[PDB]
Design a protein around this nucleic acid. Structure first.
Length: 288
DNA sequence: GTAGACCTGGACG
DNA sequence: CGTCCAGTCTAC
């Protein structure tokens, strides 16, 4: 669940559930079966509700609902995928939440590690502040000012993994692939990047996110792979055209890049128990 | 900057 | 068996 997976998932959810009426939501296992989500009791007390939209910003997804007869009464379902969260049209393994729509329609959210989150709110004010905590969506926003990179004396890989400083949506596999394509050493500080490197990086961020979004089976939303190939793709970053028809890992979790160059599995980011692995090829990515 | 935790495996020896 | 590896928040 990196930006592209969450965006595609929302598009599929919109295809199958926009305009549908939600009658009930149940947490059959995981964290929310042990302790209910924030705002759950009030939400259930207000069902049924019609789904007006399903949107995303970076890795954050949310459902917007309302009472047909009371268009003022607007509710939101906040959802975070974590590391293994997945939505599906069938009750897959690790199903945690079951959404019951009218006419027997069903939607399921499964999450093996249970790192995903759910929150219910009928406050648009709160949702807005939540969205403001996230930087511009790297996939959906075509006019981001990444030149802001230069203001940070931090490793470029850290700045890109951050969901607020420059933009939102990039995760561990996307950043590794983007820096390799841009030929930039992960350790390189944003403050040391040239304007030439900046515009180059921006190019690849768009290329990689769009390629990922257009893919049908990268592997992090397997429960909807059949649906992925039965729905189109919004034309984000209209001017960018990836040559490959399916996203492929050039360095992430690889022993060597496509040309035999050694791939290092570096521990640049995090500390203690939150250390992430950054894959890069020293022969290709340099500090220039 | 450094450490841990949330929670459940898969892959490997 | 055991040992790594696999988004985000909290605390000294």
């Amino acid at each position: 669940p990196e930006g592209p997976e969450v965006a595609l998932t929302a598009d599929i959810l919109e295809k199958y559930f926009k305009g549908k009426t939600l009658e009930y939501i149940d947490f059959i296992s995981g964290r929310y079966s042990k302790s209910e989500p924030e705002g759950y009791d009030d939400f259930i007390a207000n069902l049924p509700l019609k789904v007006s939209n399903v949107d995303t910003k970076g890795k954050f997804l949310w459902f917007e609902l309302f009472d047909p007869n009371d268009k003022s009464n607007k509710w939101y379902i906040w959802n975070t995928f974590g590391l293994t969260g997945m939505w599906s049209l069938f009750e897959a393994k690790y199903t945690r939440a079951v959404l019951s729509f009218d006419n027997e329609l069903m939607a399921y959210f499964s999450d093996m590690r249970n790192f995903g989150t759910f929150k219910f709110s009928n406050s648009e004010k709160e949702l807005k502040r939540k969205l403001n905590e996230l930087g511009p969506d790297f996939l959906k926003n075509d006019d981001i000012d990444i030149s802001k990179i230069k203001k940070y004396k931090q490793p470029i890989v850290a700045l890109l993994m951050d969901q607020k400083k420059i933009g939102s949506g990039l995760g561990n596999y996307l950043v590794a692939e983007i820096l390799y394509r841009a030929k930039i050493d992960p350790h390189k500080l944003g403050s040391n990047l040239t304007d030439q490197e900046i515009e180059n990086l921006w190019y690849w961020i768009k290329y990689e996110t769009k390629l990922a979004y257009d893919s049908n089976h990268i592997g992090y939303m397997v429960n909807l792979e059949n649906e992925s190939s039965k729905i189109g793709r919004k034309n984000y970053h209209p001017n960018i055209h990836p040559t490959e028809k399916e996203f492929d890992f050039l360095v992430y979790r690889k022993k060597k890049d496509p040309n035999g160059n050694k791939v290092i599995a570096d521990k640049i980011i995090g500390s203690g128990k939150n250390k992430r692995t950054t894959y890069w090829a020293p022969a290709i990515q340099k500090l220039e």
